[PDB]
Assembly symmetry: D2
Homo-oligomer: 450 residues x 4
């Protein structure tokens, strides 16, 4: 498949191990190929009865799948990861066509997807409860919840579908997944791959739709749980200037800047401000924008036209608020004529920024960098600590004392020093998709208090 | 202290390490000594501004307490458990006066309380994150959430206050605790004991009140999290009749039957029904009802008069629905004249019960046992499986095959065989009162995708 | 490949990713096809200089392999298990030819082998140290030991090689494996598979030899660690008689009884002695003896002629010690003429045994069952309590109390109820093949005592 | 109690909860007060029959202690730590009299001792096995080994006795402890405290003696396990010079330098050699030498006269090998006349050292520092890479990259950055003092291969 030719030719819901048209409607939405602006699908948003059919069908698959063993569930999930690995370029292509991120980034998304699949497969084989000890004992066993729902986002369509379904299925649950109406295509490749690996029909069902479809899923009595889905970058004078510039571009211009907790609030010390800016703008203007399916493309189009307009409005407002545009912030017309109707824009860098500007305190969700100058550590510590734990943060400095000091002081939950799985994350994520059943076995006689 | 003399003489809120009157009112409630019906306190339910003072004061204590080390937090919590242990009889007495459970049961409640305190003290000293490994590494650290709220119940006043505060404080959080308006007294002994062990002023604050006070706590922007707070018993013919009768009494008549997930739906096979019933009624009529502070008392009064009336209404309705009363189910007037105004009643046993009866499908929260006869395992499996996971269950049989078969088939989350801490519970409970902060330390150079 | 045709055609040592002849000699041994008595290989036992070549070559691979990430180690180990699975019938065939166990049992051994490979592959990806918190922190990291040595046995050649190398390589170690001189062939398929999966040359080397070779391995200064490699069955009257008979045969006659911790000391209550014995002898004489490569063979030949004589000698001694032979205990002459020189014997059952008999206090390591009668639970508890923790044990009873009670009193470490991976086993095994490096990072100033 | 008056007045073996004279002799040794040279005890080294009495008596306590619950074991161990805390000054005093370390350091040792006691007390309450799930399940349980043996050293007498007995007793083992014949006194305060906390008589027994006694302990068949008991400091120019000097003194002159893995091999860059050395010698000559029981003493006497001579002999050899003495390395004559026969020496600093010098490649186990100059990071990396994993190491640098990079390349197992419990250490130590008993519970029928 190449850019500018694909159209969806099959239904976009998935039930009983096959693609089906929604039995019920709650809206009608268009899916786009953002590189060209073409309509690749006009699909039906699922209604109440379609949601019920998917949840009932998933309840029937949960009964079979949960009664399987942890070793058998691991075997199938490893097979699914193998199929995702064998078909990575095909999946990344579909991911690019619908989402518009570069094939370079899409390949990484799928790598993370099947690595996550293998990870929770491993935990499903080695899953174990507790045994606690007058010769009597009790034991605990983790049990799946039943039918779970995963609500996807459009910036990482295939990856989020993988990261929500992998742990849920590993614990023995079924999942009804609702992709973002922007990106409905790639989620069915995963549903088809799960079925090819040997999951029962209905274990991973796909229902398309928007808010109404998502509301029906959350309200369903047979649904057990539902999984749903600014960050400052600080660069000191004692940092590795090269690593700070490279890290700055990696924090603002990956996936067209449409990433949660992006380092869009960049703090640079006055001592090394001109050197940083000059090197950032030069390397930013060298980023090749174009067809996502090209191996050298590092920035494709934005997700859709209304989002591109909302990003441009942020740049315009910043300009009228006193900010200076050094590059980008406007429509980009690529040489390729087949992309002429795509939603492209040049990555934007803004200088002369202030804390009162709206382009500093609002998530733009676009390729827009905000550079704010500061004098000393004291000033910059109190300007970027209004970030909540859910946000990320990053610091650049060649000092084991100064680094951890700022990372401790900051309230952000995911911090970075000089850049931007384990067991806990798996255990915590498995706990979200399971419940602990206790059993107390009295071997002797009962001691009555009466 | 003895029964029939205590009255509260000090304020019932706790702030800044001292008992204070609520700065704000949202109601006025009476606390009773249920053994005598006396009013031991008329206290003010906390209003919005009192809740705010308590949460602000707790926020100031969290800042000091969280900056302390896990070893220091463990030291103080162990000291608190020692003080609870040294003063167990004084605390159990206050617990009895206000709640009405026997001093026998109250002592067990406090044992569980300081054992829980020592447990989470231990986990606070040994708490640790993860270290994951091109020479670069990341680490995780558990951090307290801030100001937590614990909402107590009236059946286990001191124990719930301990089980909510122990893990919260162990992780470095502060807690504003709201006791049940029925049982406000004992929670301040814990707050006084925490302060005597060395917690900062405000770490464990107590605000009295009902729904309005609890709503103010949940709505407060500086509150990080809020902790809030029928089961079938199956007896087969191949069981130990003695252990099944003893287990049946222990599942219905502990804490006057005012326990969640009590085994009030008791299934007995037809083969051993008369033998079970005759032995149950004889031992039930031998339970001594009276002053909770007596060492031989096994059943005190119910929590308050409106609850006693609601329990009696359940017995009356069952009688008019065809159930047979074999003992109890009515007011009990003890010999002691000082208890003559207490809320006493004889424990009730009901035979000739049916699945359509309301006293079988509704939680009575009183000392009422419902015995239902069944022929075979098949019948009894499909009659008691309408219980949700949150409910408990119990089976009595001398068969390693038949026991686990019924415990597996049942959906109840906490099951018992022939009766009625570990690491997981602590880890899971600590996760509820904390968040995982990640740090990525890049030692080398940044690899730009561009 | 069929029975009676295979001869080794390639060298049987493995170094630098290829089969090599040992540069040094310490003996010359013959490997047999026990189904026919044929010599399938005459190989050179490795000397000191060959051992040094393998250990030096393994040290060079450890330097490369350890610098890989846990995700890369997992990826390669998952491929290795897939290749073992794709070639399971070829590996099981070679296993049968050299070892003589049934193709039915060999297939199970290799299933366990690649499942173990996937198991530790999973742990290699999720391996993590600890992060412990005056504002300073320390972290730990598990590190491979270096060059480890695995010493194999002849009863499970391919499985032991898999169970020793999988965890060692998963932690980042290299391994020089020394198969049993009886069964040298199958270990090289694993070495060939490891190299085909992508391990560096020298990561898994194979040196053949006996005690002298093993001494050179254990004495080598660059070797970090070395991994090296009677059980009672109690049957009560309340058991499932059929399951006790089937379990008894599965505890004595699997792998020609050449298994450690086999349930060869069988205690039977007097009430069900004749019924049990008659049914055991009936089913024992129905065990098909013959060519291991036949799908209906359930017992092949013993490992070699000197071992068959040693087992037969145990039967003869038992007869003159008072034991009664009900079946087997003698040579089995198959119809097939290619097997006429194989080391076959019929499975043996012995009654009227005593604890002072030599066939009761010594591990026969052959297909010989010893039936001992007992009166009560007390007697059999005091007759079987001379068992060490390292041995296994089994009980057959329909009593949740009597089972766990007898299993508790017994000293055996591995017990079975009514028959004969998790996370702990992996962690403990990983700890054997790794060491904990701690790092203390001082963020503040040093507190000098002086 | 003050220095120069104490003599032992009671027997120094401990059996059955009381001090006993050894029934058997294997030698007669003198214990000294190194501050004065006085003989505080002339005790009998235990023979074979005394060792047997202690091990048999310990086996009887293991039978009682192991049958206790983890909560009861925790309760008693928490009391033991409290008693150690209540008597810390008395224990530290006895520790000083016999060992000679400063009361300042002894107090820290005992803090670590009861903190360790509380640590494993916590793990004893929360100890749990595993529960692994064809509808059948298995469980594991950690069980004590039986009678364990702890062999103490003289540099940390009370701490080693605490760190060996705490985990052993927490897992349910008994322990027969053999102190170093140099320092036999303090180990009996712990035995007296254990008995006062409520351990059964014989759970912690103490047998005095040397190698012969230790051989009898290791050879005893009823003994289950036995627990038994140069490091470079690298200083770069970009470090906090003051913190590097303070850290250097803390790495050489704590406990009279009689510590394993002391940072005695000090590498200093040429750029900051004179400034570092001059500041180290200045602060070293300010270390107060004298009576260990004085609060301002930071260095007491060496352990005994033969050890002082062995340290002084190392200094003399270094001088004739080319080393330069800047301070210390000779006898220290205190003003106090009661200390005139003590084993004192001034702390020594050596410059102009080489790697071929004997005082650089041998552990002196005395207060002697070796300063080595180096040009670049590469040189010092290749000069200090002969260190074994068991040794410690330390680096001083203000570089998050250079620190972890040098700590990674180094082979030392315990590293320090800019200086010199968690869950893992406890679990691993508990695994040393326990074994895993597995149980497989078959719920269904047995699948016979025959
Ligand atoms: O883009 P977005 O940031 O709004 O993400 C919202 C996701 O959930 C869905 N959504 C929006 N409102 C919802 C609601 N009220 N309930 C359930 N899902 C909802 C959307 O379709 C989308 O998949
Ligand atoms: O007896 P109950 O079973 O109603 O327990 C409810 C507990 O929370 C409080 N409560 C009742 N309604 C509440 C609400 N809407 N919000 C917060 N707390 C509430 C009560 O005071 C009590 O402590
Ligand atoms: O049943 P077995 O004794 O035949 O198995 C013992 C295994 O260790 C090896 N072995 C025997 N003696 C040895 C020694 N002294 N040193 C090292 N390995 C030895 C053997 O090769 C064999 O693989
Ligand atoms: O520094 P060190 O050698 O003095 O410490 C060694 C410790 O083990 C003991 N020891 C010495 N030789 C021993 C042996 N052969 N067996 C058992 N213990 C021995 C000593 O008593 C001492 O407590």
């Amino acid at each position: 498949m190449s850019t500018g030719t694909f159209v969806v030719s099959q239904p976009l819901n998935y039930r009983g191990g096959a693609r089906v048209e929604p039995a019920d409607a709650s809206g009608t939405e268009k899916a786009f190929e953002p590189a060209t602006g073409r309509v690749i699908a006009t699909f039906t948003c699922s209604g109440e009865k379609e949601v019920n059919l998917a949840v009932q069908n998933a309840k029937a698959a949960f009964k079979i799948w949960s009664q399987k063993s942890g070793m058998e569930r691991c075997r199938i999930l490893l097979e699914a990861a193998r199929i995702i690995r064998e078909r990575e370029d095909e999946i990344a292509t579909m991911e690019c066509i619908n989402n518009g991120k570069s094939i370079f980034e899409a390949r990484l998304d799928i790598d993370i997807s099947w690595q996550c699949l293998e990870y929770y497969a491993g935990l499903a084989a080695s899953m174990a409860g507790e045994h606690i000890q007058g010769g009597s004992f009790g034991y605990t066993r983790r049990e799946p919840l039943g039918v779970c729902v995963g609500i996807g986002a459009w910036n990482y369509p295939f990856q989020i579908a993988s990261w929500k379904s992998a742990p849920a299925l590993a614990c023995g649950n079924a999942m009804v997944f609702k992709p973002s109406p922007f990106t409905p295509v790639s989620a069915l490749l995963l549903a088809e791959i799960y079925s090819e690996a040997g999951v029962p029909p209905g274990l991973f069902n796909v229902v398309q739709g928007g808010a109404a479809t998502g509301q029906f899923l959350c309200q369903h009595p047979d649904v057990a749980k539902v999984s749903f889905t600014k960050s400052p970058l600080i660069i000191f004078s004692d940092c590795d200037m090269n690593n700070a510039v490279k890290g700055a571009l990696m924090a603002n211009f990956l996936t067209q800047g449409q990433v949660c907790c992006n380092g869009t609030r960049v703090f640079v010390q006055k001592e090394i401000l001109d050197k940083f800016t000059e090197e950032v703008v030069k390397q930013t203007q060298r980023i090749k924008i174009g067809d996502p399916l090209l191996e050298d493309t590092r920035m494709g189009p934005l997700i859709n036209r209304p989002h591109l307009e909302r990003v441009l409005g942020f740049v315009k407002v910043a300009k009228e608020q006193g900010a200076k545009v050094l590059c980008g912030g406007d429509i980009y017309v690529p040489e390729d004529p087949k992309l002429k109707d795509g939603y492209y824009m040049r990555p934007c860098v803004l200088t002369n920024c202030r804390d009162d500007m709206t382009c500093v305190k609002e998530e733009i969700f676009g390729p827009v960098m905000s550079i704010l100058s500061f004098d000393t550590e004291a000033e910059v510590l109190e300007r970027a600590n209004d970030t909540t734990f859910g946000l990320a943060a990053g610091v650049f400095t060649r000092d084991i004392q100064r680094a951890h000091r700022v990372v401790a002081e900051l309230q952000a939950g995911t911090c970075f020093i000089n850049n931007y799985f384990g067991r806990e994350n798996g255990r915590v994520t498995i706990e979200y998709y399971s419940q602990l059943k206790t059993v107390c076995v009295e071997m002797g006689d009962v001691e009555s208090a009466f």
